[PDB]
Amino acid sequence: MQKAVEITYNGKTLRGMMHLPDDVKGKVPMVIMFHGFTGNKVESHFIFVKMSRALEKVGIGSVRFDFYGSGESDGDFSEMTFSSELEDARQILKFVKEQPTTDPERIGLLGLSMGGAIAGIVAREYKDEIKALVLWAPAFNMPELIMNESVKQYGAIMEQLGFVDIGGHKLSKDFVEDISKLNIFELSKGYDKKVLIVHGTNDEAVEYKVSDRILKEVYGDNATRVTIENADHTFKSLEWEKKAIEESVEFFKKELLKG
Amino acid sequence: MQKAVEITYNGKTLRGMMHLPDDVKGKVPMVIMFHGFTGNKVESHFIFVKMSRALEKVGIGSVRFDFYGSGESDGDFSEMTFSSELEDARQILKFVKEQPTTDPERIGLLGLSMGGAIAGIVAREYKDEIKALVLWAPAFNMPELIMNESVKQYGAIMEQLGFVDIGGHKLSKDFVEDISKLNIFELSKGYDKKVLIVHGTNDEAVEYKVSDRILKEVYGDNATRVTIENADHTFKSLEWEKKAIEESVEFFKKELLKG
Ligand SMILES: CCCCCCCCCC
Ligand SMILES: CCCCCCCCC
Ligand SMILES: CCCCCCCC
Ligand SMILES: CCCCCCCC
Ligand SMILES: [Cl-]
């Protein structure tokens, strides 16, 4: 079962998709997926859609929304900050918890790239009601990656205009000021339930070493990593995306279906 | 107004978005937008959503669906052919024609890249009921671009496997067999209503010369070209995207809001 859904708060409408298992009756586990920077809820080569349908096959529902300023949701990219996507995510969690078909004890979070940073922080904020966490190429170093651009041509334009063009998207100086005050590693530490990190070794956006840092600095024994050998940032191949999906589904199967 | 919509036919379910003006009610003009190859209804840097919202502002509604096999719609990419997207497009036009809010005399088509090839053929096939046509970087040379790979590494893989991996998408030999029989230039020739072609000079996917071929071989004086100087294939900058959308909205405003 796949059907479009809508969230509205503070005059903002978020547009998303919800999947529920056809066979199962009653309350089901739910995985919430957060997309990345300039991405949307379908994500690269439809990997989020494929992930939703793979979960549905094992009895696990899901929702995927576009953050405010991206995709089908309301707003322009220039209004978005990392913190405004955090507040979207809290509203998305609230939406899921309030669905009559949700098992509130079996809600999982999944995030890709900057969406992995969102997922890690929301997991920590709601550590007693998020059952499991999956991080795909999580951009915990997003603040550094943005600040590194301030000394390049982006920084000079930003100073003249208050925004920069990142390729058909208006990135506001508000985004830079907001993210420069955040430490994703610190804000994510303290989540004690099971974590799965999926990272490709040839990731040129979020270098593979970031997953080393997350295993070392953020989590304890509750986190394990699936390394996709030679894969790029979004697992852009049939074999790579299949490994990413299948490992994440089996992980969510283990953590959300029993206990 | 923006809302999710569905079409179910021949066991296939297509999923899309419909926009209606808020400030003008009753029967309104409608623009159907077709996305490109491996794209989806949001399209590159959300340009289709931005287009839908810019049309709303001038009193023009729109729909945009994911083709079967792409995005939010049903199906695997390996099930898709150019001809199956053409049949999708026929069902989308039927859907639009059957909405009570649609002015049946004021329906326009827009297509990007391979979606532009879809729009050109559909406009010609329904030439007496499509009031205006907008082509963005139209991939009328799609058959040649596919057959050009038959002598490259893709061709050798295709022969061994019956499909190729184009980056997390499975492209079937059925797609190759189907498109090798199609001449998009010939199938679009004869549409006599107004046409706008928008093309970037630095397009490296569909070379700008293709627009020269379309102006010469496909349409008469009813076609006009807007050249976006120095732009790439999907107008990936704020200024390029702004020009593409503004010129296309003013064209649809002139052609659909007449009389
Ligand atoms: C406009 C290009 C859309 C993606 C085409 C990909 C073809 C195979 C590239 C390796
Ligand atoms: C592959 C053909 C490209 C034609 C446009 C080139 C623009 C400068 C790179
Ligand atoms: C992982 C890349 C996301 C888009 C970045 C755009 C600015 C370089
Ligand atoms: C920008 C860092 C990239 C690290 C992986 C490089 C693989 C060729
Ligand atoms: Cl949608």
Numbering used by the authors:
A (entry chain A), B (entry chain B): 1 to 259
Give verbatim lines from the article.
In this work, we determined the structure of the enzyme revealing a long-chain C18 monoacylglycerol (MAG) bound to the active site, which was taken up from its expression host. In both protomers of the active Tth MAG lipase structure, we found additional extended ligand electron density pointing away from the active site crossing through a 15 Å long tunnel formed by the HBH lid domain. As we did not add any substrate to the crystallization buffer, bound ligands can only originate from the Escherichia (E.) coli expression host FA pool. To independently identify the ligand content of the extended electron density, we analyzed the crystals of the active enzyme by reversed phase liquid chromatography followed by mass spectrometry (LC-MS). A single peak found in the elution diagram corresponded to the glycerol monostearate (2,3-dihydroxypropyloctadecanoate), suggesting that under the given sample preparation and crystallization conditions Tth MAG lipase products cannot be released. Based on these data, we modeled a monostearate (C18) acyl ligand into the electron density of the active Tth MAG lipase structure. Since we observed significant connecting density between the terminal C1 carbon of the C18 monoacyl ligand and both the γ-hydroxyl oxygen of Ser113 and the O1 oxygen of the glycerol moiety, unrestrained refinement produced distances between these atoms in the range of 2.2–2.6 Å. The resulting model, which was confirmed by an omit electron density map, supports the presence of a loosely coordinated tetrahedral MAG reaction intermediate, closely matching the geometry of covalently bound tetrahedral reaction mimics in a previously established MAG lipase12. The distal part of the C18 MAG reaction intermediate involving carbon atoms C11 to C18 is held by a hydrophobic tunnel across the Tth MAG lipase HBH lid domain, which is open at both ends. In conclusion, our structural data are strongly suggestive of the hydrophobic lid tunnel to be crucial for positioning long-chain MAG esters to allow efficient turnover by lipase hydrolysis.
Lipases are enzymes that reversibly catalyze the hydrolysis and synthesis of a large variety of glycerol esters. A minimal lid domain comprising the residues 141-183 is inserted between strand β6 and helix αE on top of the CD active-site area. Different from most other lipases, in which the lid is generally formed by a bundle of α-helices, in Tth MAG lipase this domain is compact. It is formed by two small α-helices, followed by a β-hairpin and an additional α-helix, referred to as α-helix/β-hairpin/α-helix (HBH).
